[PDB]
């Protein structure tokens, strides 16, 4: 069960937070999801189809590949969208980390409780400045653009060069693995959080399934 964490830095204007950091996390979970298992008799089960599809950012130059659902992208906007205002609204150095969580949940022994054990991390350090000139935003679209291409591919190359996966599980493991809430895709248990630091002190946020 040895886990992984891996760092990316993105120094990115205000507004290229939300779609810098869709890029990452689509990406991500594009290459730790499944299709959602359709269980039968005697435990067996075939796997449903996973589509993707090209998303063109409006703030960036650049095309990222996403799992085509509507219930994830929903889910990802909202924290993403979170994170873009408590960071780029505040009065520091405009830092802050979100942190993708892969994990399983070890069912403590009746009756108490539940374990989460995370496998892989994955933290992204926003460095982000606001622009006024027009001119210079148009720079940081081009600029940004290269970068994040670089680091897509980058992070593919990553999540392959890692050793562990979860073990495949039966029916009855499921629920311990992967997030089976969602209608067209399953991805691996993930928990999703952000913090940032002032010079006041530091704020955390995680957010949470039903």
Not at 40 to 66: A, H, L, M, P
Request: proline letters at 2%; charged letters at 30%; hydrophobic letters at 35%.
């Amino acid at each position: 069960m040895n886990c992984r964490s891996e760092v990316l830095e993105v120094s990115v204007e205000g507004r290229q937070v939300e779609e810098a950091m869709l890029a990452v996390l689509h990406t991500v979970l594009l290459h730790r999801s499944t299709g959602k298992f359709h269980y039968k008799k005697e435990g067996t089960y075939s796997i449903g189809t996973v589509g993707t599809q090209d998303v063109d950012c409006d703030f960036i130059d650049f095309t990222y590949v996403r799992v085509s659902s509507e219930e994830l992208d929903r889910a990802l906007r909202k924290v993403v969208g979170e994170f873009k205002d408590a960071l780029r609204n505040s009065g520091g150095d405009g830092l802050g980390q979100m942190s993708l969580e892969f994990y399983q949940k070890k069912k403590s022994r009746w009756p108490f409780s539940d374990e989460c054990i995370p496998w892989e991390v994955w933290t992204v350090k926003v460095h982000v400045v606001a622009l006024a000139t027009e001119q210079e935003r148009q720079i940081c679209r081009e600029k940004v653009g290269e970068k994040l291409c670089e680091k897509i591919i980058n992070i593919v190359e990553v999540m392959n060069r890692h050793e562990y996966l979860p073990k495949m599980p039966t029916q009855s493991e499921v629920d311990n693995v992967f997030d089976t809430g969602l209608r067209d895709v399953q991805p691996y248990l993930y928990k999703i959080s952000f913090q940032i630091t002032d010079a006041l002190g530091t704020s955390v946020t995680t957010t949470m399934r039903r």
